[PDB]
Amino acid sequence: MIAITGATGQLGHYVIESLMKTVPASQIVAIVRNPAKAQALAAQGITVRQADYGDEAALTSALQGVEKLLLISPQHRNVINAAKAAGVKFIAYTSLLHADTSPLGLADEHIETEKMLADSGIVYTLLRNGWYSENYLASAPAALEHGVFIGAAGDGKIASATRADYAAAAARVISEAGHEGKVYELAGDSAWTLTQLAAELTKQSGKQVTYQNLSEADFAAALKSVGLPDGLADMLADSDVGASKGGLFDDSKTLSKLIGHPTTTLAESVSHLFN
Numbered sequence: 001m002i003a004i005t006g007a008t009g010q011l012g013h014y015v016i017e018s019l020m021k022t023v024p025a026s027q028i029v030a031i032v033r034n035p036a037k038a039q040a041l042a043a044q045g046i047t048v049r050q051a052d053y054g055d056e057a058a059l060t061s062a063l064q065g066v067e068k069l070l071l072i073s074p075q076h077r078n079v080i081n082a083a084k085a086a087g088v089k090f091i092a093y094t095s096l097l098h099a100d101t102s103p104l105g106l107a108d109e110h111i112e113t114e115k116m117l118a119d120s121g122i123v124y125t126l127l128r129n130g131w132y133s134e135n136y137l138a139s140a141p142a143a144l145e146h147g148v149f150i151g152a153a154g155d156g157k158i159a160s161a162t163r164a165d166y167a168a169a170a171a172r173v174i175s176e177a178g179h180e181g182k183v184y185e186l187a188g189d190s191a192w193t194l195t196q197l198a199a200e201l202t203k204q205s206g207k208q209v210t211y212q213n214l215s216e217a218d219f220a221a222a223l224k225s226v227g228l229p230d231g232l233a234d235m236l237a238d239s240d241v242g243a244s245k246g247g248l249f250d251d252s253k254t255l256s257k258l259i260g261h262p263t264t265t266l267a268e269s270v271s272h273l274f275n
């Protein structure tokens, strides 16, 4: 039996779809706060167990009979303690690429969870996921509308991959043997700068798009005047700065080796913008 916490997101959806290619639906259990609002998961035919993530006891019950748990990102403290109480034997966690040394502020919370796992006594594997190509492409439309893509990543190299790629990796780790106790640094086979992104954008769109590098404050002070919340804006700005320092770069090709095929290139992802 495989359980998935935090499976109501886009990544979780993909992981479940991937798993279903080799694991019977009933052997997959999605733990959610409200099975009613989780119509998607239920639609997949998987086992759904309700549990409030602020309720360790509820989580423990929801994890009964679970041998392997995929924890998709405190809340994690309750989940890990519950997994310990229920007898979970293996936990795979979606962390952040090179979390212990990462310049990105997003690493903080992940490190806290990685520490919890290390102290849990439960065998675990860290799926240290790099950036989603979708993270930057979410801003491609605006960049195309104004002919400029803004950021604060400088010449930092972003070894992005798709949620689908990361999801396949998670599914592989939680379902097949030989992936326990590992620390996998997962990223795209190739890497690109925001300058190259703009160029790829211009190439396939026919429209001119230039990258404009801003400073963290200006970039953030640019997102806080378009709608996006302050916290969200601050993170995005912090991330680009982390990227400018190589925080989103990795060339181990661990991801492609793990999934058995090349990671999805930026070019392919960009193509989806003009389908």
Ligand SMILES: [Cu+2]
Pocket: 268, 272
């Ligand atoms: Cu495609």
